[PDB]
Symmetry: D2
Subunit: 296 residues, 4 copies
C-alpha cells in the first residue's frame, strides 16, 4: 500500500517571473520536463520549492497546478510542512482535494519542540490528509532538529506514515534504519552521496539536482542493481562535478539557470533574499546546460 512511493523523485523548484510572482506557465513546463525524464514522482512545495518564502495560498496554487499536470502520470508527494500545525493541516487538506498520493512535512523548526510535540504535529497532519500516507523527515542540518535513532523508529511507526525522507549524510544511521525497517520507503536526501546512500540502505531519493539530470540518478539505481560498481561511481563523480558548481553559484538559482538554458523556465530567479546569479558564472552554467542536453 506504499510501494508506489519508492523511487527517484525531483524536489520541484518553483519558477518565479521577473517580479517574484509564481510563473505558472514555466511551472507546468517544469513538471512535464521532469515527467519526460522518466522520474517516478515529484516532491512539491519542499524547501527546494522555496516554500518558506511563499504564503499558504501560493503553496496551494503550486500544489494544484502540479496535480493538474502530473496526477495519474507519476507519483505526487505534497510537502505541507510549516512551523504551524494548523497551517500544515490546511495544506494537507488541499493536497488531498487535489489528488496527491502522499503528504510530507519537515520537522517544525525555529522554536524548540519536544519529541511528543513533533509526533502530535504529524498525527494532526495525517488526520487532515484524510487517508493518503505521510512522509516524515529526519533533516537535522537545515532545521536544527537532531533526532535519535529510537525516535526515528517511533516516527516511522506512527499510523499513516509511509516513508522517511532521510536528509542526512550519516550513512551509519541510514543502514540502521534499513536494518530496523526492511520494508520502509527510505529516500536519500543528500544528492552528493546518492550512490553511497543507496548502498547504505535507501531505496530511492528526493533531490533538487534531479531537476536537471534525473537520468544520472536513475542510472545509478540501475548500475547498482546491475552490479556495475564502476558505473555507479562514474555517474556520482559527474553528479558531484555539477553539485560543486551549483554550490559555488548558489544551488536553487543555479538549477533554475540551467533549466532556463534548457528552455524549461522562462525566468531563472529565486525570491529575495536570494541574490541573482553573478554574471561571471553564466558561461559555466550555459556550458553545463549544453553538456547535459547533449548527454541525452
Amino acid at each position: 500500500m506504499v510501494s508506489h512511493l519508492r523511487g527517484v523523485m525531483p524536489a520541484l523548484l518553483t519558477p518565479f517571473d521577473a517580479q517574484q510572482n509564481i510563473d505558472r506557465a514555466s511551472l507546468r513546463r517544469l513538471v512535464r520536463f521532469n515527467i519526460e525524464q522518466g522520474v517516478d514522482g515529484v516532491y512539491v512545495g519542499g524547501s527546494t520549492g522555496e516554500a518558506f518564502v511563499q504564503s499558504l495560498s501560493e503553496r496551494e496554487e503550486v500544489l494544484e497546478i502540479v496535480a493538474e499536470e502530473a496526477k495519474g502520470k507519476i507519483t505526487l508527494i505534497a510537502h505541507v510542512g510549516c512551523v504551524s500545525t494548523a497551517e500544515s493541516q490546511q495544506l494537507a487538506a488541499a493536497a488531498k482535494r487535489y489528488g496527491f498520493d502522499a503528504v510530507s512535512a519537515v520537522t517544525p523548526f525555529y522554536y524548540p519542540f519536544s519529541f511528543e510535540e513533533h509526533c502530535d504535529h504529524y498525527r494532526a497532519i495525517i488526520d487532515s490528509a484524510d487517508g493518503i500516507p505521510m512522509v516524515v523527515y529526519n533533516i537535522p542540518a537545515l532545521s536544527g532538529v537532531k533526532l535519535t535513532l529510537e525516535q526515528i523508529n517511533q516516527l516511522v511507526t506512527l499510523p499513516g506514515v509511509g516513508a522517511l525522507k532521510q536528509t542526512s549524510g550519516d550513512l551509519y544511521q541510514m543502514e540502521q534504519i534499513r536494518r530496523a525497517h526492511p520494508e520502509l520507503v527510505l529516500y536519500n536526501g543528500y544528492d552528493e552521496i546518492f550512490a553511497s546512500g543507496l548502498l547504505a540502505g535507501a531505496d530511492g531519493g528526493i533531490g533538487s539536482t534531479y531537476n536537471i539530470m534525473a537520468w544520472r540518478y536513475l542510472g545509478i539505481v540501475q548500475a547498482l542493481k546491475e552490479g556495475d560498481t564502476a558505473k555507479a561511481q562514474q555517474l556520482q563523480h559527474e553528479c558531484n562535478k555539477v553539485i560543486d558548481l551549483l554550490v559555488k553559484v548558489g544551488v536553487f538559482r543555479g538549477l533554475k539557470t540551467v533549466l532556463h538554458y534548457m528552455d524549461v523556465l522562462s525566468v531563472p530567479l529565486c525570491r529575495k533574499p536570494f541574490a541573482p546569479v553573478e554574471d561571471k558564472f553564466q558561461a559555466e552554467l550555459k556550458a553545463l546546460a549544453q553538456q547535459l542536453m547533449q548527454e541525452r
Copy 2:
C-alpha cells in the same frame, strides 16, 4: 535621533483564544499591563510573539492593535522579519503606517544566505520602513546564523540601523561591540544573564520574561547605576529562579499561564505544535503569579 530606543522592553506575547485565533481583548490588556509596569517600550511580533506560526495579515493585525494602545505612551518596535524580503517589507510598510518608532528583523533563516544577501535584505526593509530606524539581530542559537564581529560592525553601520538586539550569551562579543560602538543602542537578549550583559556593555534589553516581572529588570538597571552590586545579583537570582521554572514548563506558555493567573490574559494557550501546560505544573505557576503580584 535613536536615544529613545534605549531601555527595557518586553518582547510581547500574542494571546490566542481557545480556538487558536488572536485574542484581541487580551492583547490590548497585555499592552496596558506592560505600560503600567513602567517599561520603556514594547517589541511586537518577535519570535516571542509567535510570529512564525502567524500569517502576514495576523502579524499586521497585532502591530496595528498594539500601536493603537501604546503609540505616544512607550516606544514601539515592530519586528517585521520573515525569511522573505518582500514579506518583511510589507510588514515594515505597515509598521510605518501604524506609527511605530522602529522596525526590527531577525537574520533570515532556514536557507543559507551570504552576508551580502543579509545586508541587502536589511537595506530593502529599511527602505520600506520609510524613515524609522532598524534594529538588527545577532541571534545565532535559534536562527542558526553565526555572525562574526566584523560583520556585526558593518550591520550596525548600515544607513538606517539604529540598534542591535544581541541575542547571544557571548559577553566577550558584547563587550567588543560596546567598545567598538560606544553610542550604539545595544539590547541584551538572554534574560537569564541580564545583569551580566548590562555590565558587559548592553544598555537595555528585550526579553520575553519581562512580561511578568519587568520591575525586576528595571531594578537591575537601577542597582547597577546605583552601585548596588549585591542587589543586582539578588534580583538576577530571583529572575533565574523564575526562568528555571519557565524552562521546565515551556517558556511562552508558562509566561502566558502566569499572566492568566494575574488576570491579564483570558486564555493562556500557544499555537500548535506547542502543547498546553501539563497539569502538574499549574500549582507552581499559580503560586508564582501570586508571589509576583505580592511583590509589587
Copy 3:
C-alpha cells in the same frame, strides 16, 4: 612508491595485563592473529591502540614489538602523533629504526593551531621519519580539528605524504578527495560505513573492528570489485550489528573482550579511566566471539 600502502589494515589494540602494564605476549599474539586474517597491514599506536594513555617509551615498546612480528610479512604503519612535535619526531625516528613502512600522525589537538602550524608539524615529522612516507589525518570528530577541502589538498601534496586516513562520515568530501587525487591512498576511517566509503572513493580502510572480523571487510572490498552489491550490503549489515553491540558495551573493551574469548588476548582490560565491561554484556560478547569463529 606508495602502492604497498593501499588496503585493509586493523588499527591495532594494545593489550594490557591485569595491572594496566602492556601485555607483551598478548600483543605478539594479536599481531599474528591479524596476519593470519589475511590483512594487508597493521596500524600501530593509534587512538585505538590507546596511545593517548601511554608514555612515549611505552608507545616505542609497542612499535618495536609489532615490527618484530610483522616486518616483511604485512605493511607496517606507525602512528607517531602527539600534541608535541618533538614527541612525534621521537616516535617517528623510532619507527624508522624499527623498519616501519610508513608513519602517521593525528592532527595535533586540544590547543588551537593554525593550518600552517599543522603543516610545519607534519613537515618536521616527515623529516624525522627519514624517508618513509607519512599518512595524514582528516579526523574532525575526536580531535575537534575541522579541515576544509582546500586544506586537505595541500596536506596530501606535502612532500613525503603518501596517504590520507579519512576519519569522517562525509562521503561527499570522500568523493571530492578521490576526484581531486585519483592516485591517492585513501583510507576509510568509519568502519560502520565501509562499503559506502569505498563506493565514494576510499581504496582501503583502517579500523578498530577489523581486529575481530577482518574477513568481512576484505569480503566487502571483494564484493564491490566483483559487482555483488547485495553481498557488500549484507556484509556491512553484519558488521554494523557487531558495531551496534560494541557501541553499547564500549568499543575498545568490547573488542578486547571478544579477542579474549577467541583466545587471542589473556586479559581484556583497557586503561583507566575506561571502566571494565559490565557483567550483563559478557554473554552477548562471548556469543559474538563464538559466532565469528564459526564463520571462519
Copy 4:
C-alpha cells in the same frame, strides 16, 4: 577548610629555553613576579602551562620548582590532569609530596568517557592526593566534554572536591551553580568576561592573562565589592583590549613575549607545534609591556 582557595590566581605559563627545554631560572622568576603582583595563588601545570606538550617528569619538575618558590606565600594549586587516571594519580601524589594546597584535573578528553567514568577518575586522583582538596573542571570548549548542570552538582559533591574551575562563557549556568552551591569556591575561567562572571556568581578566577596584569583583575574584584560599576567596566575594557591583541598574535606566546619585555622571562618561546610570534607584532607587544609597567 576550603576558603583559602578563593581568589585570583594566574594559570602559570611554563618558560622554555631556546631549545624547547624548561627554563628553570625564568620559571622561578615568573613565580616571584606573580607573587609580587599580589595574587592569591598560582595554578600550575594547566593547559596554559603547556602541560599537554610535556612529559610527566617535566610536569613534576615544574610542580616541585613552583612549590619551592611559593609554598607558604600564596596558595598552590597543581593541575595533575591527564587522559590517563594512573598518570594523573602520579602527578597528584607528587603535588602532595611537594606541599601543594590543592590539585585540579581537566575532564579526561579525546576518548568518550561516561559520566561515571569521569567521577571514578576524580575519585582515584583525590585518593592519591592524600588529603588535599580537588578542583574540578567544567571546560567544554577545549576538551569537548559538555556537562549538564545536574552532573556538575554531583561533581562538586564528590568527597574531597573543594572548588570548581568554570571554564565556560555560559553565565546562566554560572548563576545556577552559585545558587545551588552558595559556599562553593567558583573560579571564572574566561578572562574576557571576568567582571560579568563575578557578577554572575564566581568568587574568583584562574586565568592565563593574569600573568601580565593581575592588578586589573584584582581591581575588578575590588570595584565590584566597592560598588564602582563603571570602574569594573573600564578595567574589563582594558583587559579585553589586551586579550584582543593576544588572540591576534597567539595567546600563550603573546603572554610570554610580554613577560620577556618586562624582564621576567629570558626566552618567550612556546613548544612546537606553536610557531614563534610573527615579527610584525613585536612593536605592539613591546608597547603593551611598556604600558603595563607604567600602569603599576
